[PDB]
């Protein structure tokens, strides 16, 4: 620590003692329902971009590994989460948004994108988390004479909000003259169909886009990964995983009268004091494991090589053992005899070499 | 069978310090927590509606704005739920919350609502709506209108979820909106995802059997939530016992 | 224009609590005490 | 009456509370919790998020140490004054006016 | 987090600098207390008969009754600072 | 965003914008009509709240620091505009410092030299 | 800029720290003036015949 | 003759002037003007550019406050000395040599 081969007499702060966790406990909801991803991803027909289909996914355990196992998904882009960690997390607010767009419009299904379908058909929020899936659908969503079943809103008065659908087939006024609901000069219908044909190359072919939307930890979760629940252990330093929340601490019984909606317990500094478990609705108080600073009390290396260690602010039962207000001192023998301070320990205790003695 | 039976008069009262709710599901004890959310501002203008049926359309639909604080001093059987939506007809989805003696049914369908909807008592919903098609949500649970007793509710429609908060208070020999704090607790979060711009209260009417329905009255208070920063006091047991509205006056701003 | 440019960006100069007149009055009081009373006024009555 | 000493205690506790409170700051990252960032992102982007958190927390800690040093200088000046008063007022009689 | 520590190592000796500065402040506080109070090398004690020609020093001399061995004024000072 | 007052600055014909010593825009030439305007940003002030203890009273006074009283029991001080305190020609010791020799106290809240 | 303020809020209580430090300096300057000049509680006046 | 007081005024004005000059620094962003970034860039990239400007301006402001604290400490020491001179030279006769 001192970057020297000779250490002078004194007390030196070297490292931090911390008791390590003994085992990992994963607590997940016992309920297991196969999640219906087959319905969303393998559907024969998808909706248009102006009237995009939203399906809610809740109260299921999702295996995302099969999505990878069979996959014509040319584009698999995630924004707020890793693809391989999806099996290890718990979610709520899961939504699958399915629609069909152009080949060149796949860049516009992103937060903050500038476009026609971005503004008037499907808007993403700036703080969006989830994954966008895009795949070519020339084999199913194209016809040789032109498949015109997919329509987009070319014209609208104002931009849409995030996750808002507009299906109103009213006329738009593109010029100074009012249109009064009748088409004519500078009065056009807002919804126009795409000219999808198989003869075109990539970039104009119909593309099926599915947007998976999640929320991260801000509500009780109902969609979880395939991870198995382990048993709960009390009064031991463990690394726990409650619904995707990982922490290292000792779980103890609590006397805090939590309200039925309440799960998390927070102290003055928003530190998670307590947690509730989905599988068993009980409150486990969370306390960080024992730790402290280690100070090495030593005389000069010129004099001796004996050292004593002070664990600061740590009682002697959690690590020539002497308990001081400063901490637990190992390696020094307390002497009743009072002398002047040679190496300061703290709280009136000083150490000296005569063996290393500690005294008031 | 849509019939216009309810007439409604309105007055204006003061909100005092009513309308505080738990903004999240996190236990906090003996702390001061400042949160920014849709809250009913302190001493705000709240409309007191008196709905009278005696034995023309005079019971209009109220706007929803950004969320609604509802209060009632009536018994649990007279006010039986609410109606939420935009057009309140078969072309858009709408939310109907109906409570009875045993449970609550919350249901989102394409209801063709009557102009003056009321549940008439068995109980019939033929005077609430004429048709209900393409129904997309249903949720049945224990009721939140149970048995002088002030009943307070907070309805929010935020990012797809309709959040309902409720509190009951044993009021006595005081103006119906009492002083002091009664924090409302989160009761249900519903993943609805519909557009709500207008709302209406549902009353229960009894058949007369002798002027087809028995004469009755219901009084309720409606206030509107605003984006406001509050400083809430959490006591030893986690209860919100006090709050200061950060933007009400310079003194409270100093406290904030 | 230095003061205006600083003010526009949210930097404000708060006025001193004691004005120059009051500080001058305090110095005048100290001078009157030290001239008419010597060092007695600093240790008790003048 | 004892406002000065209490003020020192008040500043120290407040500084520590501020330093603890700064752990709840995203600092332009997705989350303020490191475990969530690790449990949710791949190392190429988790490294970026952890870098944002590290620079913000390190800046907070340096700010705390700098104000601690300035307060230490002020308290050292006060202690030197107290030692001077102990030597000159307690251990002798002082002819310095108002000292 | 081990990964965070690994990324933290790229910034150099910032942690060592902060620890050294705090250690300097910590030893400085003890030095301040030594300088102010430890100005006598003899622990003097008052005579058992506390008569000083009419002068009463009960409020400033140590109280035998208190376990803390503090004066009434010192006891009041300790109570009033929290 | 700012007030556009009349300008006495004579621009040369090729110049369009104008800048301060601290490189902040202080002038501009109108494109439609060749006239010079002094761009001055809108008034801002530090709102300070003067209050006695809540144990004693809940009355407050507001000091807008640096703001003239015509740009916001209204009294004008060199510190700014003080609203909610009544100026008294009597002089007392300072209880709540306002600035520029003005102090405030509760007896209602009064402001005095 | 409202967007800038929203982004600024993520950094925590830096703004509060800076305001508190400047407020401490501001009250300190007035305290300095009181310590140096307000050392008498009586405003003495010179005789008319100087 | 009166250089010391003038220096104090000059340093304060210079610090304020430097702080205003810091607003015209890009800090590694496309522009030093927030309005230009808002008008020319979509929010994904705008957040990054405003983040760069926020961190640079915040660092400048922190630097200014730290300098002000050190100068305030120096002026406090000078004011304490001035109060000591007022007590011991004006309100009494001092036997301290050269004080
Ligand atoms: C109170 O409401 C509940 C729920 O709507 C009613 O219970 C239902 O009764 C119908 C008969 O029309 C049955 O088909 C359902 O299976 C029942 N559901 C449940 C959950 O019990 C109940 O009848 C209502 N009671 C009154 C007095 O109106
Ligand atoms: C010195 O002062 C102390 C306290 O100021 C005196 O103690 C008081 O004695 C009277 C009469 O005996 C009691 O009524 C008071 O309660 C005592 N005060 C306290 C604080 O205990 C003491 O008498 C004085 N004289 C001597 C010689 O000690
Ligand atoms: C997907 O649908 C095809 C028919 O289009 C069917 O043959 C196949 O079995 C389906 N796969 C799954 C996993 O549902
Ligand atoms: C499964 O979890 C639910 C809560 O989601 C709980 O009510 C139930 O008791 C659990 N099942 C078992 C067997 O513990
Ligand atoms: C409440 O609103 C009504 C009209 O909206 C208004 O006349 C009345 O004065 C308001 N109440 C108060 C206390 O301002
Ligand atoms: C709604 O109902 C009408 C008629 O019952 C039907 O034409 C329409 O397709 C329905 N829409 C949905 C989404 O069920
Ligand atoms: C909600 O409905 C109202 C009433 O038709 C409409 O004006 C408003 O635009 C709708 N809101 C959204 C976000 O579509
Ligand atoms: C909190 O809970 C305790 C224990 O049940 C109870 O005695 C007390 O009255 C409750 N309320 C308050 C305000 O402490
Ligand atoms: C531009 O138009 C305005 C308004 O008609 C006129 O006053 C001005 O002379 C024109 N030319 C220039 C160079 O501004």
Short mmCIF file of N, CA and C in Angstrom, two decimals, chain H residues 26-95:
data_model
loop_
_atom_site.label_atom_id
_atom_site.label_comp_id
_atom_site.label_asym_id
_atom_site.label_seq_id
_atom_site.Cartn_x
_atom_site.Cartn_y
_atom_site.Cartn_z
N UNK H 26 -18.19 25.19 -26.35
CA UNK H 26 -18.96 24.04 -26.82
C UNK H 26 -18.83 22.83 -25.90
N UNK H 27 -17.65 22.66 -25.28
CA UNK H 27 -17.33 21.54 -24.38
C UNK H 27 -17.38 20.20 -25.10
N UNK H 28 -17.14 20.21 -26.41
CA UNK H 28 -17.19 18.99 -27.17
C UNK H 28 -18.55 18.67 -27.73
N UNK H 29 -19.45 19.64 -27.77
CA UNK H 29 -20.75 19.48 -28.39
C UNK H 29 -20.76 20.20 -29.72
N UNK H 30 -21.87 20.06 -30.45
CA UNK H 30 -21.96 20.66 -31.78
C UNK H 30 -22.04 22.18 -31.69
N UNK H 31 -22.65 22.70 -30.63
CA UNK H 31 -22.85 24.14 -30.50
C UNK H 31 -22.89 24.49 -29.02
N UNK H 32 -22.61 25.75 -28.73
CA UNK H 32 -22.66 26.22 -27.36
C UNK H 32 -24.03 26.79 -27.02
N UNK H 33 -24.94 26.82 -27.98
CA UNK H 33 -26.27 27.37 -27.79
C UNK H 33 -27.25 26.21 -27.68
N UNK H 34 -28.02 26.19 -26.59
CA UNK H 34 -28.98 25.11 -26.39
C UNK H 34 -30.10 25.17 -27.42
N UNK H 35 -30.53 26.39 -27.77
CA UNK H 35 -31.61 26.58 -28.73
C UNK H 35 -31.27 25.99 -30.09
N UNK H 36 -30.01 26.15 -30.51
CA UNK H 36 -29.57 25.59 -31.79
C UNK H 36 -29.63 24.07 -31.78
N UNK H 37 -29.24 23.46 -30.67
CA UNK H 37 -29.28 22.00 -30.55
C UNK H 37 -30.73 21.52 -30.54
N UNK H 38 -31.61 22.24 -29.85
CA UNK H 38 -33.02 21.86 -29.81
C UNK H 38 -33.66 22.01 -31.18
N UNK H 39 -33.30 23.06 -31.91
CA UNK H 39 -33.94 23.31 -33.19
C UNK H 39 -33.38 22.41 -34.29
N UNK H 40 -32.12 21.99 -34.18
CA UNK H 40 -31.51 21.25 -35.28
C UNK H 40 -31.41 19.76 -35.03
N UNK H 41 -31.61 19.29 -33.81
CA UNK H 41 -31.41 17.89 -33.49
C UNK H 41 -32.62 17.26 -32.82
N UNK H 42 -32.87 16.00 -33.16
CA UNK H 42 -33.94 15.23 -32.58
C UNK H 42 -33.54 14.86 -31.15
N UNK H 43 -34.51 14.57 -30.27
CA UNK H 43 -34.19 14.34 -28.82
C UNK H 43 -33.14 13.27 -28.52
N UNK H 44 -33.10 12.08 -29.19
CA UNK H 44 -31.98 11.14 -28.92
C UNK H 44 -30.58 11.73 -28.91
N UNK H 45 -30.24 12.53 -29.92
CA UNK H 45 -28.92 13.14 -29.99
C UNK H 45 -28.87 14.44 -29.22
N UNK H 46 -30.04 15.10 -29.10
CA UNK H 46 -30.12 16.34 -28.34
C UNK H 46 -29.79 16.10 -26.88
N UNK H 47 -30.23 14.96 -26.33
CA UNK H 47 -29.93 14.64 -24.94
C UNK H 47 -28.43 14.52 -24.73
N UNK H 48 -27.73 13.94 -25.71
CA UNK H 48 -26.28 13.79 -25.61
C UNK H 48 -25.60 15.15 -25.67
N UNK H 49 -26.03 16.01 -26.60
CA UNK H 49 -25.38 17.32 -26.75
C UNK H 49 -25.64 18.22 -25.55
N UNK H 50 -26.89 18.26 -25.07
CA UNK H 50 -27.21 19.02 -23.87
C UNK H 50 -26.51 18.41 -22.66
N UNK H 51 -26.30 17.09 -22.64
CA UNK H 51 -25.59 16.48 -21.54
C UNK H 51 -24.15 16.96 -21.50
N UNK H 52 -23.53 17.12 -22.67
CA UNK H 52 -22.16 17.61 -22.74
C UNK H 52 -22.10 19.05 -22.27
N UNK H 53 -23.08 19.86 -22.69
CA UNK H 53 -23.10 21.26 -22.28
C UNK H 53 -23.37 21.38 -20.79
N UNK H 54 -24.27 20.54 -20.26
CA UNK H 54 -24.61 20.58 -18.84
C UNK H 54 -23.40 20.21 -18.00
N UNK H 55 -22.67 19.16 -18.40
CA UNK H 55 -21.53 18.75 -17.59
C UNK H 55 -20.43 19.81 -17.64
N UNK H 56 -20.22 20.44 -18.81
CA UNK H 56 -19.17 21.44 -18.89
C UNK H 56 -19.52 22.70 -18.10
N UNK H 57 -20.77 23.16 -18.22
CA UNK H 57 -21.20 24.36 -17.50
C UNK H 57 -21.26 24.10 -16.00
N UNK H 58 -21.70 22.91 -15.60
CA UNK H 58 -21.75 22.55 -14.20
C UNK H 58 -20.35 22.47 -13.61
N UNK H 59 -19.39 21.97 -14.39
CA UNK H 59 -18.01 21.91 -13.92
C UNK H 59 -17.46 23.32 -13.76
N UNK H 60 -17.81 24.22 -14.69
CA UNK H 60 -17.35 25.60 -14.61
C UNK H 60 -17.92 26.28 -13.38
N UNK H 61 -19.20 26.04 -13.10
CA UNK H 61 -19.87 26.65 -11.96
C UNK H 61 -19.30 26.10 -10.65
N UNK H 62 -18.98 24.81 -10.62
CA UNK H 62 -18.38 24.21 -9.43
C UNK H 62 -17.00 24.79 -9.19
N UNK H 63 -16.25 25.02 -10.27
CA UNK H 63 -14.92 25.60 -10.18
C UNK H 63 -15.02 27.01 -9.62
N UNK H 64 -16.03 27.77 -10.08
CA UNK H 64 -16.21 29.14 -9.63
C UNK H 64 -16.57 29.18 -8.15
N UNK H 65 -17.44 28.27 -7.71
CA UNK H 65 -17.86 28.23 -6.31
C UNK H 65 -16.69 27.83 -5.42
N UNK H 66 -15.84 26.91 -5.88
CA UNK H 66 -14.67 26.51 -5.11
C UNK H 66 -13.69 27.67 -4.97
N UNK H 67 -13.47 28.42 -6.06
CA UNK H 67 -12.59 29.58 -5.99
C UNK H 67 -13.16 30.63 -5.05
N UNK H 68 -14.48 30.79 -5.07
CA UNK H 68 -15.13 31.76 -4.20
C UNK H 68 -14.98 31.35 -2.75
N UNK H 69 -15.05 30.05 -2.47
CA UNK H 69 -14.89 29.57 -1.10
C UNK H 69 -13.48 29.82 -0.59
N UNK H 70 -12.48 29.57 -1.43
CA UNK H 70 -11.09 29.82 -1.02
C UNK H 70 -10.85 31.32 -0.81
N UNK H 71 -11.36 32.16 -1.72
CA UNK H 71 -11.21 33.60 -1.55
C UNK H 71 -11.98 34.10 -0.34
N UNK H 72 -13.15 33.51 -0.07
CA UNK H 72 -13.92 33.88 1.10
C UNK H 72 -13.16 33.54 2.37
N UNK H 73 -12.44 32.42 2.36
CA UNK H 73 -11.62 32.06 3.51
C UNK H 73 -10.49 33.06 3.70
N UNK H 74 -9.89 33.51 2.60
CA UNK H 74 -8.80 34.47 2.68
C UNK H 74 -9.29 35.82 3.19
N UNK H 75 -10.44 36.27 2.70
CA UNK H 75 -11.04 37.52 3.14
C UNK H 75 -11.52 37.41 4.57
N UNK H 76 -12.01 36.24 4.99
CA UNK H 76 -12.40 36.04 6.38
C UNK H 76 -11.20 36.16 7.29
N UNK H 77 -10.05 35.63 6.87
CA UNK H 77 -8.84 35.75 7.67
C UNK H 77 -8.41 37.21 7.76
N UNK H 78 -8.51 37.93 6.64
CA UNK H 78 -8.17 39.35 6.63
C UNK H 78 -9.13 40.15 7.50
N UNK H 79 -10.42 39.81 7.46
CA UNK H 79 -11.42 40.48 8.28
C UNK H 79 -11.21 40.20 9.76
N UNK H 80 -10.82 38.97 10.10
CA UNK H 80 -10.51 38.65 11.49
C UNK H 80 -9.30 39.44 11.95
N UNK H 81 -8.32 39.60 11.07
CA UNK H 81 -7.16 40.42 11.41
C UNK H 81 -7.57 41.87 11.58
N UNK H 82 -8.47 42.36 10.72
CA UNK H 82 -8.93 43.74 10.80
C UNK H 82 -9.71 43.99 12.08
N UNK H 83 -10.53 43.02 12.48
CA UNK H 83 -11.26 43.12 13.74
C UNK H 83 -10.31 43.12 14.92
N UNK H 84 -9.25 42.32 14.84
CA UNK H 84 -8.24 42.30 15.89
C UNK H 84 -7.50 43.62 15.97
N UNK H 85 -7.21 44.23 14.82
CA UNK H 85 -6.57 45.54 14.81
C UNK H 85 -7.52 46.60 15.35
N UNK H 86 -8.80 46.48 15.05
CA UNK H 86 -9.78 47.45 15.54
C UNK H 86 -9.88 47.37 17.05
N UNK H 87 -9.88 46.16 17.59
CA UNK H 87 -9.94 46.01 19.03
C UNK H 87 -8.65 46.44 19.70
N UNK H 88 -7.50 46.05 19.16
CA UNK H 88 -6.25 46.24 19.87
C UNK H 88 -5.49 47.51 19.50
N UNK H 89 -5.72 48.09 18.33
CA UNK H 89 -5.04 49.33 17.99
C UNK H 89 -5.92 50.55 18.16
N UNK H 90 -7.21 50.43 17.86
CA UNK H 90 -8.10 51.58 17.92
C UNK H 90 -8.73 51.71 19.30
N UNK H 91 -9.16 50.60 19.87
CA UNK H 91 -9.86 50.63 21.14
C UNK H 91 -8.92 50.50 22.32
N UNK H 92 -7.62 50.45 22.07
CA UNK H 92 -6.64 50.37 23.13
C UNK H 92 -5.28 50.66 22.54
N UNK H 93 -4.29 50.72 23.42
CA UNK H 93 -2.91 50.92 23.01
C UNK H 93 -2.20 49.57 23.07
N UNK H 94 -1.56 49.20 21.98
CA UNK H 94 -0.96 47.88 21.84
C UNK H 94 0.54 47.90 22.08
N UNK H 95 1.02 46.92 22.83
CA UNK H 95 2.44 46.75 23.08
C UNK H 95 3.05 45.72 22.15
#
